[PDB]
């Protein structure tokens, strides 16, 4: 609450100093706990002021004027703290109104490759530190993977679409500045099977609950039994889920076999008793005949004949008592048996109606991670799960493009300029680009630094789209190999009227096979106008890229009619299909932690490259080639906020380097 809220909303602990701060304020962190708590209030209070209104540049003069002693006291420390938050982009980022118009005495020159959000965030920061910044993008528009489709009042995002909570999200600040309209998302999502009828409710829950367990089970499998390598090869979340399901199937059988083997041991005991009772009956039979024969010797008989009746009479009432007690412990075993033959264990682990609803839960996972589960690291797929924001996820009714468009305002963005070669040396860098329209036309940009927001997809392509001169060193390229670049596609269906449940944000279709859990597995409304997004995920995303839009929209209306009626669902006015893996300025959707990657590759991807020296025996040059992007930020990968933070970061790194540290 208050000073502490601002720390948390700035992704920082109010309690204690970060590593970034230890680096810049070693005097303090190594010094007494008293001076640390001062530092910490100034930092938190300075942040609070920024956030409390982030449409106005917050100056040094301003912050000092709204501290009060004892913190107010040391006006150097306050100016250091203010200038630290300024670089590292914790305050005065996004769209502020500058109070002092930045001077035209621009110092140092930087080429930024790509009008990413990462690109634009950095561009704006470097500009506000008074550097000379030019952005070079291949596309005919800014935004990159923040692509929004307009056509009349119809507006739908084919790229980033969701603000994944405002609780510590830097986009929380950008939304106040840009006045983009955020609508909430009710995550409740009814399923509907292939046949087109809502999975009933008690099913929905049995399967979800079982999904949620099966995951937790891979986590136990990973951390507890250390099942993370198998035949010299890293285990996938996929492999682990199969090995868990195969074992839950194997326990169902072990369980039946244990139960029938227990019935059989009872029947083999009832048998040992019947064999005994049948030998006593046929022996009693014999003895009774002997008693009647002896009993029928009419008296007056002597005493041995009298003893013979009296004896046999006993010997029989004895064997009759044995067989009465064997026949009671018979009637116990026939109940023990009507008990067991009435209380079986479970027949199956999952039916095929079940194993298919489970497959829709695996598509939702394949959709979120933008890749088949066969590719996700078992040890590391959920590494960023610590830094997830707070509050409900939100769509942008407005269309997310409204952000990068607003970030672009005031930058030297050269559009339709495909970078082809980045050359970096002791004395500086040349970027060589071409006009994407007429490609013979060649452009040369000279600069002190190159900032590369090139997507991991592009960085991966062979033969390469962009050549580095000299080559990126193994440690960098190896990381680009190890790291995963995924895929996820949307289908935009604009109708004339709403024929779905307006108070339901999303709903799912369950495919008939595992092999296509992903094919049009889920449907959103923007709900503003009558639009339905349909997501393609998993192995499916990749394959549906070679299938005409008419066919995809066919499979779509097919499904929708299944669920809502035939005369209910009209033809769409307008349809679009994303084909991200095909798009050569993307080569896919966003990063993922592949098996045999870690989070540590995200860190390699951010470390800048320092050229060798030009004259042998010459001071160690400065770093020249820097990297930002969704794929460079360990704790917030594959997002917009992660991009935006990665840019804010490389801006600091480059100013620290070329304008000397604050």
């Amino acid at each position: 609450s208050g000073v502490e809220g601002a720390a948390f909303q700035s992704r920082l602990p109010h309690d204690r100093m970060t590593s970034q701060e230890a680096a810049c304020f070693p005097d303090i962190i190594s010094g007494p706990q008293q001076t640390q708590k001062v530092f910490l209030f100034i930092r938190n209070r300075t942040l609070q002021l920024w956030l409390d209104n982030p449409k106005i540049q917050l100056t040094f003069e301003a912050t000092l004027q709204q501290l009060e002693a004892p913190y107010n006291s040391d006006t150097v420390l306050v100016h250091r703290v203010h200038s630290y938050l300024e670089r590292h982009g914790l305050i005065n980022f996004g769209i502020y109104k500058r109070i002092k118009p930045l001077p035209t005495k621009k110092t140092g020159k930087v080429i930024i490759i790509g009008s990413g959000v990462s690109g634009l965030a950095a561009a704006r920061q470097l500009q506000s530190f008074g550097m000379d910044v030019t952005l070079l993008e291949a596309r005919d528009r800014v935004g990159g993977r923040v692509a929004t489709f307009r056509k009349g009042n119809y507006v739908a995002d084919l790229g980033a679409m969701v603000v994944t909570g405002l609780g510590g999200n830097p986009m929380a600040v950008v939304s106040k500045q840009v006045n983009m309209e955020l609508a909430k998302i009710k995550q409740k999502c009814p399923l509907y099977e292939a046949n087109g009828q809502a999975v009933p409710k008690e099913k929905d829950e049995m399967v979800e609950q079982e999904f949620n367990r099966l995951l937790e089970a891979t986590s136990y499998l990973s951390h507890q039994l250390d099942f993370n390598v198998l035949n010299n090869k890293p285990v996938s979340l996929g492999q682990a889920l199969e090995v868990v399901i195969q074992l839950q199937e194997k326990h169902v059988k072990d369980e039946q076999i244990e139960h029938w083997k227990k019935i059989v041991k009872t029947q083999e005991e009832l048998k040992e008793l019947l064999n005994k009772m049948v030998n006593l009956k046929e022996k009693i039979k014999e003895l009774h005949q002997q008693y009647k024969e002896a009993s029928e010797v009419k008296p007056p008989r002597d005493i041995t004949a009298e003893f013979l009746v009296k004896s046999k009479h006993r010997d029989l009432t004895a064997l009759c008592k044995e067989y009465d007690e064997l026949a009671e412990t018979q009637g116990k075993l026939e109940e023990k048996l009507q008990e067991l033959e009435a209380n079986p264990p479970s027949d199956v682990y999952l039916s095929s109606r079940d194993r298919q609803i489970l497959d829709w839960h695996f598509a939702n996972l394949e959709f979120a991670n933008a890749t088949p589960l066969s590719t996700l690291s078992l040890k590391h797929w959920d590494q960023d799960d610590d830094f997830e924001f707070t509050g409900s996820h939100l769509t942008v009714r407005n269309g997310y493009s409204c952000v990068p468009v607003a970030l672009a305002e005031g930058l030297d963005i050269k559009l339709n300029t495909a970078v082809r070669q980045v050359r970096y040396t002791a004395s500086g860098c040349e970027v060589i680009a071409v006009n994407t329209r007429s490609t013979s036309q060649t452009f040369i940009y000279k600069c002190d630094a190159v900032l590369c927001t090139l997507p991991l997809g592009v960085l991966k392509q062979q033969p390469p789209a962009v050549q580095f001169v000299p080559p990126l060193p193994e440690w960098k390229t190896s990381a680009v190999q190890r790291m995963g670049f995924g895929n996820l596609n949307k289908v935009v269906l604009c109708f004339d009227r709403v024929f779905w449940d307006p108070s339901v944000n999303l709903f799912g279709h369950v495919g008939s096979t595992t092999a296509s859990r992903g094919e049009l597995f889920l449907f959103w409304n923007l709900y503003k106008a009558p639009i339905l997004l349909a997501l393609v995920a998993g192995e499916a995303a990749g394959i549906m890229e070679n299938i005409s839009d008419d066919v995809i929209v066919g499979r779509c209306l097919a499904i929708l009619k299944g669920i809502f009626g035939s005369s209910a669902v009209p033809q769409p006015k307008e349809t679009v299909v994303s084909r991200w893996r095909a798009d050569p300025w993307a080569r896919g959707s966003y990063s993922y932690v592949a098996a045999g990657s870690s989070g540590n590759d995200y860190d390699l991807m951010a470390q800048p490259i320092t050229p060798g020296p030009s004259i042998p025996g010459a001071p160690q040059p400065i770093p020249r080639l820097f990297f930002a992007g969704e794929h460079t930020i360990r704790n917030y990968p594959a997002t917009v906020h992660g991009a935006l933070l990665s840019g804010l970061r490389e801006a600091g790194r480059i100013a620290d380097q070329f304008l000397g540290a604050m």
């Binding site: 969701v162 994944t164 009710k186 995550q187 409740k188 999502c189 399923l191 929905d204 399967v207 979800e208 949620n212 829709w360 839960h361 939702n364 996972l365 979120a368 959920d382 799960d385 997830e388 996820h393 999303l506 799912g508």
Partner: peptide, 7 residues
Amino acid sequence: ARXMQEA
């Protein structure tokens, strides 16, 4: 379902 795994 609930709509989880979109952390």
